[PDB]
Design an enzyme around this catalytic site. Structure first.
Site, PDB file in Angstrom:
ATOM      1  N   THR A 155       0.872  -1.269   0.091  1.00  0.00           N
ATOM      2  CA  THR A 155       0.041   0.116   0.140  1.00  0.00           C
ATOM      3  C   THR A 155       0.814   1.268   0.065  1.00  0.00           C
ATOM      4  N   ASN A 203      27.744  -0.737  -6.889  1.00  0.00           N
ATOM      5  CA  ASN A 203      26.881  -0.173  -5.718  1.00  0.00           C
ATOM      6  C   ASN A 203      25.355  -0.309  -5.798  1.00  0.00           C
ATOM      7  N   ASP A 251      22.863   0.755  -7.449  1.00  0.00           N
ATOM      8  CA  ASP A 251      22.192   1.989  -7.602  1.00  0.00           C
ATOM      9  C   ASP A 251      21.487   2.245  -8.646  1.00  0.00           C
TER      10      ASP A 251
HETATM   11  C1  LIG Z   1      15.348   7.895  -9.712  1.00  0.00           C
HETATM   12  O1  LIG Z   1      15.126   9.104  -9.579  1.00  0.00           O
HETATM   13  C2  LIG Z   1      15.915   9.725  -8.294  1.00  0.00           C
HETATM   14  C3  LIG Z   1      15.528  11.329  -8.459  1.00  0.00           C
HETATM   15  O2  LIG Z   1      16.262  11.779  -9.753  1.00  0.00           O
HETATM   16  C4  LIG Z   1      17.212   9.385  -8.470  1.00  0.00           C
HETATM   17  O3  LIG Z   1      17.857   9.760  -7.319  1.00  0.00           O
HETATM   18  C5  LIG Z   1      19.078  10.667  -7.182  1.00  0.00           C
HETATM   19  O4  LIG Z   1      20.217  10.339  -7.650  1.00  0.00           O
HETATM   20  C6  LIG Z   1      21.249  11.157  -7.624  1.00  0.00           C
HETATM   21  C7  LIG Z   1      22.517  10.638  -7.844  1.00  0.00           C
HETATM   22  O5  LIG Z   1      22.635   9.432  -7.030  1.00  0.00           O
HETATM   23  C8  LIG Z   1      21.286  11.610  -6.154  1.00  0.00           C
HETATM   24  O6  LIG Z   1      21.978  12.806  -6.002  1.00  0.00           O
HETATM   25  C9  LIG Z   1      22.822  13.061  -4.808  1.00  0.00           C
HETATM   26  O7  LIG Z   1      22.110  14.093  -3.811  1.00  0.00           O
HETATM   27  C10 LIG Z   1      22.840  14.399  -2.756  1.00  0.00           C
HETATM   28  C11 LIG Z   1      22.027  15.261  -1.943  1.00  0.00           C
HETATM   29  O8  LIG Z   1      20.956  14.413  -1.603  1.00  0.00           O
HETATM   30  C12 LIG Z   1      19.994  15.150  -0.605  1.00  0.00           C
HETATM   31  O9  LIG Z   1      19.422  16.155  -1.321  1.00  0.00           O
HETATM   32  C13 LIG Z   1      18.366  15.721  -2.434  1.00  0.00           C
HETATM   33  C14 LIG Z   1      17.381  17.054  -2.841  1.00  0.00           C
HETATM   34  O10 LIG Z   1      16.627  17.626  -2.063  1.00  0.00           O
HETATM   35  C15 LIG Z   1      17.315  14.763  -1.731  1.00  0.00           C
HETATM   36  O11 LIG Z   1      16.473  14.419  -2.408  1.00  0.00           O
HETATM   37  C16 LIG Z   1      17.966  13.564  -1.042  1.00  0.00           C
HETATM   38  O12 LIG Z   1      17.118  12.914  -0.463  1.00  0.00           O
HETATM   39  C17 LIG Z   1      17.686  11.302  -0.416  1.00  0.00           C
HETATM   40  O13 LIG Z   1      18.220  10.991   0.898  1.00  0.00           O
HETATM   41  C18 LIG Z   1      17.138  11.084   2.027  1.00  0.00           C
HETATM   42  C19 LIG Z   1      18.016  10.471   3.282  1.00  0.00           C
HETATM   43  O14 LIG Z   1      19.329  11.116   3.403  1.00  0.00           O
HETATM   44  C20 LIG Z   1      15.861  10.543   1.881  1.00  0.00           C
HETATM   45  O15 LIG Z   1      15.063  10.914   2.638  1.00  0.00           O
HETATM   46  C21 LIG Z   1      15.500  10.483   0.437  1.00  0.00           C
HETATM   47  O16 LIG Z   1      14.485   9.514   0.398  1.00  0.00           O
HETATM   48  C22 LIG Z   1      16.696  10.567  -0.710  1.00  0.00           C
HETATM   49  O17 LIG Z   1      17.292   8.927  -0.372  1.00  0.00           O
HETATM   50  C23 LIG Z   1      17.557   8.197  -1.470  1.00  0.00           C
HETATM   51  O18 LIG Z   1      18.615   8.977  -2.110  1.00  0.00           O
HETATM   52  C24 LIG Z   1      19.900   8.735  -1.739  1.00  0.00           C
HETATM   53  C25 LIG Z   1      21.200   9.355  -2.236  1.00  0.00           C
HETATM   54  O19 LIG Z   1      21.080  10.720  -2.165  1.00  0.00           O
HETATM   55  C26 LIG Z   1      20.345   7.210  -0.970  1.00  0.00           C
HETATM   56  O20 LIG Z   1      21.306   7.058  -0.283  1.00  0.00           O
HETATM   57  C27 LIG Z   1      19.092   6.567  -0.322  1.00  0.00           C
HETATM   58  O21 LIG Z   1      19.095   5.305  -0.243  1.00  0.00           O
HETATM   59  C28 LIG Z   1      17.815   6.932  -1.286  1.00  0.00           C
HETATM   60  O22 LIG Z   1      17.935   6.005  -2.393  1.00  0.00           O
HETATM   61  C29 LIG Z   1      19.084  14.243   0.137  1.00  0.00           C
HETATM   62  O23 LIG Z   1      18.137  14.754   1.019  1.00  0.00           O
HETATM   63  C30 LIG Z   1      24.444  14.602  -2.972  1.00  0.00           C
HETATM   64  O24 LIG Z   1      24.933  14.837  -1.769  1.00  0.00           O
HETATM   65  C31 LIG Z   1      25.040  13.571  -3.711  1.00  0.00           C
HETATM   66  O25 LIG Z   1      26.500  14.024  -4.123  1.00  0.00           O
HETATM   67  C32 LIG Z   1      27.439  13.250  -3.723  1.00  0.00           C
HETATM   68  O26 LIG Z   1      27.923  12.253  -4.501  1.00  0.00           O
HETATM   69  C33 LIG Z   1      28.244  12.561  -5.819  1.00  0.00           C
HETATM   70  C34 LIG Z   1      28.845  11.613  -6.778  1.00  0.00           C
HETATM   71  O27 LIG Z   1      30.311  11.878  -6.977  1.00  0.00           O
HETATM   72  C35 LIG Z   1      29.144  14.111  -5.674  1.00  0.00           C
HETATM   73  O28 LIG Z   1      28.927  15.000  -6.915  1.00  0.00           O
HETATM   74  C36 LIG Z   1      29.301  14.852  -4.480  1.00  0.00           C
HETATM   75  O29 LIG Z   1      30.310  15.348  -4.268  1.00  0.00           O
HETATM   76  C37 LIG Z   1      28.808  13.980  -3.268  1.00  0.00           C
HETATM   77  O30 LIG Z   1      29.897  13.335  -3.112  1.00  0.00           O
HETATM   78  C38 LIG Z   1      30.122  13.573  -1.489  1.00  0.00           C
HETATM   79  O31 LIG Z   1      29.393  12.675  -0.605  1.00  0.00           O
HETATM   80  C39 LIG Z   1      29.407  11.147  -0.695  1.00  0.00           C
HETATM   81  C40 LIG Z   1      28.201  10.670  -0.189  1.00  0.00           C
HETATM   82  O32 LIG Z   1      28.459  10.961   1.412  1.00  0.00           O
HETATM   83  C41 LIG Z   1      30.946  10.742  -0.475  1.00  0.00           C
HETATM   84  O33 LIG Z   1      30.992   9.458  -0.817  1.00  0.00           O
HETATM   85  C42 LIG Z   1      31.904  11.606  -1.374  1.00  0.00           C
HETATM   86  O34 LIG Z   1      33.160  11.091  -0.736  1.00  0.00           O
HETATM   87  C43 LIG Z   1      31.821  13.167  -1.453  1.00  0.00           C
HETATM   88  O35 LIG Z   1      32.168  13.787  -0.274  1.00  0.00           O
HETATM   89  C44 LIG Z   1      24.067  13.259  -5.094  1.00  0.00           C
HETATM   90  O36 LIG Z   1      24.490  14.212  -5.792  1.00  0.00           O
HETATM   91  C45 LIG Z   1      19.659  12.253  -5.403  1.00  0.00           C
HETATM   92  O37 LIG Z   1      19.851  12.437  -3.918  1.00  0.00           O
HETATM   93  C46 LIG Z   1      18.625  11.145  -5.707  1.00  0.00           C
HETATM   94  N1  LIG Z   1      17.651  11.595  -5.006  1.00  0.00           N
HETATM   95  C47 LIG Z   1      16.503  11.021  -4.612  1.00  0.00           C
HETATM   96  C48 LIG Z   1      15.348  11.647  -4.275  1.00  0.00           C
HETATM   97  O38 LIG Z   1      16.602   9.820  -4.550  1.00  0.00           O
HETATM   98  C49 LIG Z   1      17.673   7.949  -9.045  1.00  0.00           C
HETATM   99  O39 LIG Z   1      18.945   7.809  -9.154  1.00  0.00           O
HETATM  100  C50 LIG Z   1      16.682   7.515  -9.834  1.00  0.00           C
HETATM  101  N2  LIG Z   1      16.971   6.078 -10.325  1.00  0.00           N
HETATM  102  C51 LIG Z   1      17.457   5.494 -11.218  1.00  0.00           C
HETATM  103  C52 LIG Z   1      17.654   3.953 -11.339  1.00  0.00           C
HETATM  104  O40 LIG Z   1      17.500   5.852 -12.286  1.00  0.00           O
HETATM  105  C1  LIG Z   2      -4.614   9.410  -1.508  1.00  0.00           C
HETATM  106  O1  LIG Z   2      -3.140   9.402  -1.225  1.00  0.00           O
HETATM  107  C2  LIG Z   2      -2.762   8.842   0.033  1.00  0.00           C
HETATM  108  C3  LIG Z   2      -3.843   8.414   0.942  1.00  0.00           C
HETATM  109  C4  LIG Z   2      -3.200   7.779   2.055  1.00  0.00           C
HETATM  110  C5  LIG Z   2      -4.217   7.315   3.345  1.00  0.00           C
HETATM  111  O2  LIG Z   2      -4.973   8.273   3.637  1.00  0.00           O
HETATM  112  N1  LIG Z   2      -4.238   6.017   3.550  1.00  0.00           N
HETATM  113  C6  LIG Z   2      -4.949   5.381   4.568  1.00  0.00           C
HETATM  114  C7  LIG Z   2      -4.490   4.140   4.873  1.00  0.00           C
HETATM  115  C8  LIG Z   2      -3.757   3.699   3.615  1.00  0.00           C
HETATM  116  C9  LIG Z   2      -3.933   4.893   2.759  1.00  0.00           C
HETATM  117  C10 LIG Z   2      -2.339   3.332   4.626  1.00  0.00           C
HETATM  118  C11 LIG Z   2      -2.039   1.896   4.903  1.00  0.00           C
HETATM  119  N2  LIG Z   2      -2.891   1.739   6.040  1.00  0.00           N
HETATM  120  C12 LIG Z   2      -3.428   0.466   6.449  1.00  0.00           C
HETATM  121  O3  LIG Z   2      -4.078   0.388   7.738  1.00  0.00           O
HETATM  122  C13 LIG Z   2      -3.417  -0.682   5.304  1.00  0.00           C
HETATM  123  C14 LIG Z   2      -4.407  -0.774   4.214  1.00  0.00           C
HETATM  124  C15 LIG Z   2      -4.351  -1.594   3.352  1.00  0.00           C
HETATM  125  C16 LIG Z   2      -3.481  -2.682   3.538  1.00  0.00           C
HETATM  126  N3  LIG Z   2      -3.244  -3.918   2.724  1.00  0.00           N
HETATM  127  N4  LIG Z   2      -2.459  -4.453   3.323  1.00  0.00           N
HETATM  128  N5  LIG Z   2      -1.850  -4.065   4.523  1.00  0.00           N
HETATM  129  C17 LIG Z   2      -2.482  -2.687   4.619  1.00  0.00           C
HETATM  130  C18 LIG Z   2      -2.613  -1.740   5.507  1.00  0.00           C
HETATM  131  C19 LIG Z   2      -3.124   2.934   6.788  1.00  0.00           C
HETATM  132  C20 LIG Z   2      -3.071   3.995   5.776  1.00  0.00           C
HETATM  133  C21 LIG Z   2      -1.948   7.743   2.515  1.00  0.00           C
HETATM  134  C22 LIG Z   2      -1.181   8.170   1.319  1.00  0.00           C
HETATM  135  C23 LIG Z   2       0.431   7.786   1.669  1.00  0.00           C
HETATM  136  C24 LIG Z   2       1.225   8.514   0.585  1.00  0.00           C
HETATM  137  C25 LIG Z   2       0.831   8.794  -0.397  1.00  0.00           C
HETATM  138  C26 LIG Z   2      -0.431   9.104  -0.806  1.00  0.00           C
HETATM  139  C27 LIG Z   2      -1.466   8.624   0.232  1.00  0.00           C
HETATM  140 CA   LIG Z   3      -3.181  -2.347   0.424  1.00  0.00          CA
END
Ligand SMILES: *[C@@H]1O[C@H](CO)[C@@H](O[C@@H]2O[C@H](CO)[C@@H](O[C@@H]3O[C@H](CO[C@H]4O[C@H](CO)[C@@H](O)[C@H](O[C@H]5O[C@H](CO)[C@@H](O)[C@H](O)[C@@H]5O[C@H]5O[C@H](CO)[C@@H](O)[C@H](O)[C@@H]5O)[C@@H]4O)[C@@H](O)[C@H](O[C@H]4O[C@H](CO)[C@@H](O)[C@H](O)[C@@H]4O[C@H]4O[C@H](CO)[C@@H](O)[C@H](O)[C@@H]4O)[C@@H]3O)[C@H](O)[C@H]2NC(C)=O)[C@H](O)[C@H]1NC(C)=O
Ligand SMILES: COc1cc(C(=O)N2C[C@@H]3[C@H](C2)[C@H]2CN(C(=O)c4ccc5[nH]nnc5c4)C[C@@H]32)cc2ccccc12
Ligand SMILES: [Ca+2]
Ligand SMILES: COc1cc(C(=O)N2C[C@@H]3[C@H](C2)[C@H]2CN(C(=O)c4ccc5[nH]nnc5c4)C[C@@H]32)cc2ccccc12
Ligand SMILES: [Ca+2]
Ligand SMILES: [Ca+2]
Ligand SMILES: [Cl-]
Ligand code: NA
Ligand code: NA
Ligand SMILES: [Zn+2]
Length: 806
Positions: free
Chosen positions: A159, A685, A687
């Protein structure tokens, strides 16, 4: 603490959230136990029910009523949705003929057509046909609007991962909602269905549609509804919001239904009990469309009817227990059910070892209904590895089954008959998409597509620039009448070198041999032409792939195949060749069995060497263009060039050889010729993105020859198979794969048998989109076709699933 002593008077379903301890009146206040004391009385009125009746027509307003049937109700925006039908002689929306909506017909002061997302939980794709008799409103949206036969969810087909992928356009590994249940080791915190941790913002990554809209000046209705708010009240709230003054009215809204998932779990996807929930969802759709029609918005709003995942038959008796395989079962923590994720129960246990757990779970029972993987070995099409919340050990569970740790978990935690979460290519997991409105096409069927693509389209519908995401923007342009997004092809970053003959045989000290010193202006001219690219139009049908990063590479031409040879990775990035329906398969002649030939166009310094393969007792080699498909005995020598060689484990060579010797010719026979592009992928890695040179963890022993983690092939032909692949006038057909380059075939339980019994099953499991290969290689394919770029983007997102008919 919430001082619930404030009041909801004039605040019912307020759009801005107020800060604690001030009490709330928004659609989630119940879920926080934070509503003001009078929220139920004022905001959740139920008196007289949800429908006008003949005697209420023209009533004096009673503010206590759930909805109104008085003359003033339309301008107040709070009529029962059937008001004009009962009281003003109107027809229900469903009874009106459909009429093309060529332009938005909106009230004055609407800046754009609103978007309403009507999301249905567990709505399996086949319900659209199978439930059609009992869903007339939905059937009218489907037949009059734009619809797909099904929409593919993301894995796991749970979900939260899917609803959040719909909202963000990201894979779960990127948005961070990798399951319905998760442990984040950095936070040391657990996200659970029940409880408060899931309300913490830190779990939710990326940028969901309501944030994208708000940041760009587009107002959004809140997407979440406390479960106890009845559906009728959710609909009336949305309709009330649509009657707000222009400056206050949102442009994007979501409705969510817990049905049919709720009943599907209890009764199975097709239980007799499922008819009523389907009828009730359709009635809700009817209330919305009647309500829009009353407000003159039924030809103004774009409506999307979309599900998160389907539902499969699953019962308690179909559970595998890890306690039947593991001796150490109490030393692990399992996230159970329709997928498994295993980690150590205690980080202080030094004797925990993932390798021994994997081995104990691998091919142990003849009909075993799950398969273990280290997460980096899961099919790349799942995109399910690059997040610390995803455990290193994963179990892919067969459809219809569960995995659990011990029997006591199942009878001390049978009720349910349905579940979901399985591999997102499984037919029972597919869900629905219908788009209806001025911006969607009229009476148009589109091919199935993945739910990651929709965020871009919803951004297009609202005139928003999408945040970076995993959709391919433009791939769904064919759903849309207007607001299409017209991208440009990416610019090539590295241009190739075209080397001629530059090295003498004796400059090469590679430890290679070939019995090829065996010998005419007629045919010496002919070999020169082939090396300069004279057959290139036959083998490179869609132009050469563009290299989208900085590197050094060479184009190499041959009679039978063309390649882009990397001087950095010492092997091709891509090798392209066409096999006609008439092509003949031959064997590798005896005298050529161990033949590897230096390529006089490429320096010894940028070549592989045979001595390294000799020394590496684990690593062998294969060829990208297969010598089996050589056009003639003389052309076959080209196939043994060191520049066509790639490192391959012997176990992998079994797979590769069968693909090249048997399957390519089989596809050319079935598809009327195929064009194949094959190559290595390096993703150490995990990714999903091409590795740089400094990320490679393994090399052929004693050399700088990097070992691929995977091998890909993209197999293209004419969609009209009456035309041969090399003379195709119209649309293309593609299938592709990304095979894991593994030193054993432990993934295939039948691999002791002949390759005709297991290889093709492996390849199907590792089916891929071209776009997945693009991410993994930094290459851009199909640069030179006669097709529109949007059509090509759609082709690149195509996944061949091998599942029978939906
Ligand atoms: C699908 O689409 C998505 C979106 O386009 C693609 O994901 C992007 O990939 C980019 C390249 O990997 C990546 O860019 C990095 O951004 C870093 C800054 O990131 C923060 O800010 C952004 C912007 O707001 C934000 O979105 C990020 O959010 C991630 O992290 C938080 C957790 O901390 C999560 O809440 C969120 O879910 C998201 O997590 C996901 O991505 C991260 C990676 O960022 C993963 O680790 C998680 O598992 C998860 O997948 C962040 O809040 C920036 O720091 C990076 O730059 C570093 O690396 C490059 C490489 O050389 C370099 O240029 C820089 O110098 C820097 O290197 C230094 O730091 C390194 C790491 O510590 C270190 O090893 C070195 O030594 C250096 O010191 C990088 O540019 C981007 O963040 C993600 N975005 C998202 C939303 O995921 C994805 O690739 C696509 N998938 C496919 C298959 O195509
Ligand atoms: C309409 O958009 C959204 C609506 C919502 C939103 O309001 N909710 C209300 C419910 C469902 C979506 C979430 C999952 N859950 C459950 O109890 C649950 C449901 C079905 C399952 N099947 N198997 N196990 C299960 C566990 C509690 C939350 C959550 C969102 C979260 C992220 C993005 C959009 C959202
Ligand atoms: Ca469900
Ligand atoms: C879904 O994405 C986000 C959600 C948020 C955000 O406001 N959050 C995170 C949680 C909760 C509040 C929403 C609702 N839902 C539930 O489980 C839910 C829904 C209906 C219910 N009835 N009864 N119990 C229920 C539980 C999941 C979502 C904040 C975010 C902030 C930044 C980026 C994304 C965010
Ligand atoms: Ca060897
Ligand atoms: Ca990588
Ligand atoms: Cl989960
Ligand atoms: Na020789
Ligand atoms: Na095996
Ligand atoms: Zn469910």
């Amino acid at each position: 603490w919430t001082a619930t002593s404030g009041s909801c008077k004039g605040r019912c379903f307020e759009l801005q959230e107020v800060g604690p301890p001030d009490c709330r009146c928004d659609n989630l206040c119940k879920s926080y136990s934070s509503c003001c004391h009078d929220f139920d009385e004022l905001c959740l009125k139920t008196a007289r029910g949800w429908e006008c009746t003949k005697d209420r027509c023209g009533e004096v307003r009673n503010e206590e009523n759930a909805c109104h049937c008085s003359e003033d109700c339309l301008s107040r925006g709070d009529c029962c949705t059937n008001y004009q039908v009962v009281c003003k002689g109107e027809s229900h929306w469903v009874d009106d003929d459909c009429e093309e909506i060529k332009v938005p017909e909106c009230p004055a002061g609407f800046v754009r057509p609103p978007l309403i997302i009507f999301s249905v939980d567990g709505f399996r794709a086949s319900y659209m046909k199978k439930g059609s008799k009992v869903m007339p409103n939905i059937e009218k949206l489907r037949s009059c609007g734009t619809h797909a036969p099904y929409m593919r969810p993301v894995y796991p087909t749970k979900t939260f991962p899917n609803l959040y992928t719909l909202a963000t356009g990201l894979y779960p590994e990127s948005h961070g909602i990798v399951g319905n249940s998760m442990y984040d080791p950095v936070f040391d915190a657990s996200f659970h269905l029940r409880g408060r941790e899931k309300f913490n913002h830190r779990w939710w990554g990326g940028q969901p549609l309501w944030i994208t809209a708000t940041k760009q000046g587009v107002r959004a209705g809140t997407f979440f509804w406390s479960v106890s708010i009845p559906h009728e009240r959710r609909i009336l709230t949305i309709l009330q919001w649509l009657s707000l003054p222009d400056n206050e009215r949102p442009s994007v809204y979501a409705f969510y239904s817990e049905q049919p998932d709720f009943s599907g779990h209890k009764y199975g996807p097709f239980g007799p009990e499922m008819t009523n929930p389907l009828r009730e969802i359709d009635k809700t759709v009817g209330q919305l469309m009647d309500g829009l029609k009353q407000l003159r918005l039924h030809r103004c709003v774009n409506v999307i009817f979309v599900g998160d995942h389907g539902m499969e038959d699953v019962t308690c008796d179909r559970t595998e227990f890890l306690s039947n395989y593991l001796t150490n079962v109490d030393d692990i923590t399992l996230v159970p059910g329709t997928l498994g994720r295993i980690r150590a129960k205690s980080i202080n246990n030094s004797k925990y070892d993932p390798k021994t757990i994997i081995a104990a779970l691998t091919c142990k029972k003849p009909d075993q209904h799950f398969k273990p993987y280290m997460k980096q070995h899961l099919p790349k099409r799942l995109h399910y590895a690059n997040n610390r919340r995803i455990e290193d050990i994963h179990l892919l569970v067969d459809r219809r089954w569960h995995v659990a740790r011990k029997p006591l978990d199942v009878y001390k935690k049978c009720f349910f008959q349905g579940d979901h979460g399985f591999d997102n290519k499984v037919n029972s997991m597919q869900t629905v998409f219908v788009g209806y409105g001025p911006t969607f096409k009229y009476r148009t069927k589109v091919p199935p597509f993945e739910n990651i693509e929709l965020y871009n389209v919803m951004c297009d519908l609202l005139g928003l620039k999408p945040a970076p995401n995993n959709g391919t923007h433009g791939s769904l342009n064919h759903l849309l009448r207007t607001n299409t997004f017209r991208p440009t092809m990416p610019d090539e970053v590295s241009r190739p070198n075209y080397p001629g003959i530059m090295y003498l045989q004796s400059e090469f000290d590679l430890g290679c041999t070939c019995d090829d010193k065996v010998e005419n202006k007629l045919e010496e001219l002919n070999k020169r032409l082939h090396t300069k690219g004279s057959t290139k139009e036959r083998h490179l049908l869609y132009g050469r792939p563009a290299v989208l990063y900085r590197t050094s590479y060479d184009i190499l031409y041959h009679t039978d195949f063309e390649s882009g040879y990397s001087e950095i990775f010492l092997m091709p990035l891509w090798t392209s060749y066409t096999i006609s329906k008439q092509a003949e398969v031959s064997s590798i002649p005896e005298h050529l069995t161990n033949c590897v030939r230096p390529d006089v166009r490429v320096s010894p310094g940028f070549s592989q060497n045979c001595l390294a393969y000799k020394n590496d007792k684990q690593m062998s080699y294969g060829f990208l263009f297969p010598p089996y498909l050589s056009s003639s005995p003389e052309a076959k020598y080209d196939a043994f060039l060191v520049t066509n060689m790639v490192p391959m484990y012997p176990a992998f060579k079994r797979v590769w050889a069968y693909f090249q010797r048997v399957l390519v010719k089989k596809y050319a026979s079935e598809r009327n010729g195929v064009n194949v592009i094959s190559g290595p992928i390096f993703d150490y890695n995990y990714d999903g993105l091409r590795d740089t040179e400094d990320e490679i963890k393994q090399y052929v022993e004693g050399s700088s020859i990097p070992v691929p983690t995977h091998y890909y092939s993209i197999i293209t032909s004419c969609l009209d198979f009456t035309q041969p692949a090399d003379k195709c006038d119209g649309p293309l057909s593609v299938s592709s794969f990304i095979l894991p380059h593994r030193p054993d075939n432990d993934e295939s339980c039948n691999s002791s048998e002949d390759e005709s019994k297991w290889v093709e099953e492996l390849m199907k499991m590792h089916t891929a989109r071209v776009r997945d290969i693009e991410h993994l290689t930094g290459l851009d394919f199909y640069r030179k076709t006669s097709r529109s770029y949007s059509e090509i983007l759609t082709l690149k997102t195509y996944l061949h699933t091998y599942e029978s008919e939906i």
